[PDB]
Nucleic acid binder design. Structure first.
Lengths: 64, 457, 89
RNA sequence: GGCGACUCUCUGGUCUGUAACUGACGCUGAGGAGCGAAAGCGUGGGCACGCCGUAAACGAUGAGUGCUAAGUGUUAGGGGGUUUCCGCCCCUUAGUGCUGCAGCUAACGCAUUAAGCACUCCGCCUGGGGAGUACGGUCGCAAGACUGAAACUCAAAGGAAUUGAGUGGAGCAUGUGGUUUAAUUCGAAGCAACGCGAAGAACCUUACCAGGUCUUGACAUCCUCUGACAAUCCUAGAGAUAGGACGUCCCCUUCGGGGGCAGAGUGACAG
RNA sequence: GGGCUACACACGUGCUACAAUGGACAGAACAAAGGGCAGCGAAACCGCGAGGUUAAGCCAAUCCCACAAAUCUGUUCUCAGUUCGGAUCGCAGUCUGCAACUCGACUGCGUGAAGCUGGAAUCGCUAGUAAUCGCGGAUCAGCAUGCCGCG
RNA sequence: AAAAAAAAAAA
């Protein structure tokens, strides 16, 4: 499939944007692999940091 | 607890009862309290453990009526007879019974006794190790014993058919200890005819373990020291010699072919180094035991032939007429003329050649070409006779420690004679399995012989 | 040659049921044996077999005769077989 | 040597740029210096911090530079042209694989990340055992680490290759895989599923998807109703989807009207 | 439209090799079974060849399918990745369907590869066991290393 | 068919 961020031309992922991040976490809250979400390597890395920042500020769960 | 279990069992014994799940039993018994439900579960488990009820693969309870491992088995087998196993066996522990074997033999299959009767006939007891008692059908050892088919006797070692703990222990007719046997007792007249016989289960206690060497020294070498040592047994050994000669004379008169070939025996030491290569001689003591095992084997085969139940035979078919024609042309070059045609030769006509070539330079080769003209003996469910022994009925009964066919013969004896199970379903079961067993064991025998020869060479 | 051994040798030589080919090879080979030795080919053949269960003895004799003949250097099978028989003899 | 929850503070190196400047300002480096798993050791701690410095830390491929087919991923940028883009597709560097030619190799292989063809410099080897031992060491707190024998002994030791100790494999089909895909429909999923189907996938099949769609619908049970139903050329399109022209006779009426094909709408439902 | 015909990368299953008991390349043949009216299709028939062609006879002991092949025979090749057997890839035509593009069959026509006999596996065995060679039909636009029945 | 056992059996 296609990268969300290269597609929609999103250069900057934001940890505050919970709704976006929630598209990339599983039911249990596990970060979905790149192979499953079609994400670019570049954006997987940015995305991963965002989710971890989000988890830290209790925007997202560690474990659902 | 017990009153509840009885009530549940009574309910399940009713004629209208069908196998029910735990929930269906709860409903049918009107159990509404959690403590009564706990009682039901405990009762079902306890009754299932006692084997009074059975749980099906669909978790329904029902009444039963209405519905390394070889070595572990060997290790669990008792080293002594259980008193319960003496039941319905003839007690022969007070009789003079002996084994006669090779000095190195530890797997003693057979024990013999001879009594001369007042009318001048002989009573011969042949008492064979009851291996079928310890190696039950479909046991781990049984499956392995089928796979092996026979013991293999290599130059330096034996590969046994059954584990050494049984073969040398509880199955072996060890000296002066109680042993279970399947016995063939035969009354034999002055012409070597079996006039009466009985096949039965017994318990024996061997008086002595003899060797072929010791028995020859007593009978042939007239050894006074050994006769004094075995003074009580010497009369029996002399009657055994006479009876064996009578049986041999009858066997030869019937026209059996005495294939007495010089075989090599390789002699090794305890380290397996070769010491010597000698001619294997068959002494009087070996030939005596041979005749007793032969008459027991014939008697068992004849008994089961007339009983007309599925059984296993040791057959030797008639020679190939073309091979035999070539043999008859061959011996004519040496000036030996045989009475008969290749398509209807009597064994006696071949024996007459062996007797005529005895102690001649051409003996070994006429003997060898005669053998090559014969067929191989094999196991078969059909009684096709045994050409080489000039007999219509022959089986192997006398060595169940080392031959799986003999172990099958013992099981068929127990099934048909002792247990009286001659029903159609029992016969069909054996009629189906005996062809495969006969083919396999005949293959395993050839494989053993080819390996033994390969080690000799 | 009124010989079952010959007939059996033909069967061992035969490939893909082509019995004719094998018959021809054998008869030609036996001609080569007679032309060299002067002896009867059959006699030489039987001598060859001697040097190479009773049924299995012949089986192995003929099998080896043929197997090794095929491995020899001479160009045709009739010559390879002749030379292997002559050697065996 | 080695680094993974996160943030901030301080601070290395590298790449793509680009072309402004500098203008050979370079390279390898014995020595030396620092860094250097683990462990051991030492002190307060169950970790900090010093010695000690080896380890498949060589890692069995020293460092730098030039030259010498390919075909393809992967990481980070740049250039072009359908392209705002998205997105594909080519061109170029940097890192990292993969399969291979030249040449090289005893063989195995190497292959622009060379074990090819070259130049420079540094480390190293010149049979094995004795032996990393001996001995002076030198470093430590110590264990060790470090440098490194010989007599004598033995014709060997060692590398690769080695080959042992009916069907398979060689070359092309097929069917269920799996994987590659938007979709690659499956049932069957040993038995009969795995040439098997279905006695013929280019297409239909074909499910399933990517797109164009239509909707009593593709079509019935209905019905009341009436036009026969349509054929056909034109317009399109990938065709569906059909829209038009033109062309149609209701089946059958003892003639009340009921009834083909269904126009027709019909209505629960279509299948 | 596509794909199921991918093909990353497995197995089951099926054919063509590993020549000489064979490759050429001529000459002589010997089979059975099955099918055909919307057809079956001869001669002559184009054709390097593959396909078209027109039309007899038969509606089937009267026609057509229809020429079984393997094999025998000499001529090579001659133990050679070859005259081993055929991959593959150019390029050449002929049919058919709606059109051979993914993904047809066939021939023209170079190249001619692998392969010079595959461990465990797991059977049986004398005439066509067998194996080889076939051959016809079904199905079906096209086209069977499939399959059916028969030689 | 000259050298033989396999299979009698031995057990």
């Amino acid at each position: 499939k296609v990268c969300y961020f290269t597609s929609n031309g999103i250069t900057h992922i934001d940890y505050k944007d919970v709704d976006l991040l929630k598209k990339f976490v599983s039911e249990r809250g596990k970060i979905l692999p790149r192979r499953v979400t079609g994400t670019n390597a570049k954006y997987q890395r940015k995305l991963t940091a965002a989710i971890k920042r989000a988890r830290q500020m209790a925007l997202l769960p560690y474990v659902s | 607890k017990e009153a509840f279990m009885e009530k549940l069992l009574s309910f399940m014994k009713e004629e209208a009862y069908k196998p029910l799940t735990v929930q269906e039993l709860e409903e049918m018994l009107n159990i509404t309290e959690a403590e009564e439900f706990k009682e039901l579960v405990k009762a079902l488990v306890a009754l299932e453990e006692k084997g009074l009820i059975v749980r099906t693969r669909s978790d329904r309870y029902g009444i039963p009526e209405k519905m390394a491992d070889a070595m572990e088995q060997a290790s669990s087998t008792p080293d002594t007879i259980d008193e319960k196993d003496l039941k319905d066996r003839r007690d022969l522990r007070d009789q003079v019974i002996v084994t006669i074997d090779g000095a190195d033999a530890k797997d003693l299959d057979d024990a013999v006794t001879v009594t001369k009767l007042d009318d001048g006939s002989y009573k011969l007891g042949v008492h064979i190790a009851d291996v079928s008692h310890y190696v039950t059908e479909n046991s781990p050892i049984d499956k392995e014993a089928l796979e092996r088919g026979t013991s293999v006797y290599l130059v330096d070692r034996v590969i046994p058919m059954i584990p050494h703990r049984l073969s040398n222990g509880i199955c072996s007719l060890n000296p002066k200890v109680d042993r279970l046997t399947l016995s063939c007792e035969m009354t034999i007249n002055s012409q070597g005819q079996v006039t009466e016989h009985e096949i039965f289960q017994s318990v024996i206690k061997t008086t002595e373990r003899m060797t072929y060497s010791d028995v020859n020294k007593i009978l042939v070498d007239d050894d006074e020291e050994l006769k004094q040592k075995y003074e009580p047994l010497v009369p029996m050994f002399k009657d055994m010699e006479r009876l064996a000669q009578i049986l041999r004379d009858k066997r030869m008169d019937r026209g059996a072919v005495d294939f007495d070939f010089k075989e090599a025996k390789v002699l090794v030491d305890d380290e397996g180094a070769v010491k010597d290569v000698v001619i294997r001689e068959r002494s009087v003591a070996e030939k005596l035991i041979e005749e007793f095992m032969l008459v027991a084997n014939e008697t068992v085969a004849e008994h089961f032939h007339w009983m007309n139940v599925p059984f296993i035979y040791r057959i030797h078919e008639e020679p190939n007429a073309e091979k035999l024609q070539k043999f008859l042309e061959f011996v004519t070059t040496f000036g030996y003329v045989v009475k008969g045609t290749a398509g209807n030769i009597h064994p006696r006509a071949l024996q007459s050649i062996l007797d005529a070539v005895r102690d001649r330079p051409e003996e070994t080769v006429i003997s060898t070409v005669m053998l090559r003209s014969m067929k191989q003996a094999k196991y078969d469910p059909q009684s096709l006779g045994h050409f080489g022994l000039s007999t219509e009925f022959y089986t192997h009964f006398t060595s169940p420690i080392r031959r799986y066919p003999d172990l099958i013969v013992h099981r068929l004896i127990r099934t048909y004679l002792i247990n009286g199970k001659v029903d159609e379903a029992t016969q069909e079961k054996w009629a189906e399995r005996l062809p495969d067993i006969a083919e396999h064991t005949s293959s395993m025998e050839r494989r053993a012989v080819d390996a033994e020869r390969e080690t000799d060479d | 040659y009124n010989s079952k051994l010959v007939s059996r040798l033909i069967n061992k030589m035969m490939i893909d049921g082509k019995k004719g080919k094998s018959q021809t090879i054998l008869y030609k080979s036996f001609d080569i044996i007679k032309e060299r030795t002067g002896n009867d080919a059959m006699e030489v053949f039987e001598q060859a077999l001697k040097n190479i269960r009773p049924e299995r003895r012949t089986t192995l004799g003929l099998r080896w005769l043929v197997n090794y003949a095929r491995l020899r250097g001479e160009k045709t099978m009739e010559e390879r077989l002749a030379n292997e028989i002559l050697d065996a003899a």
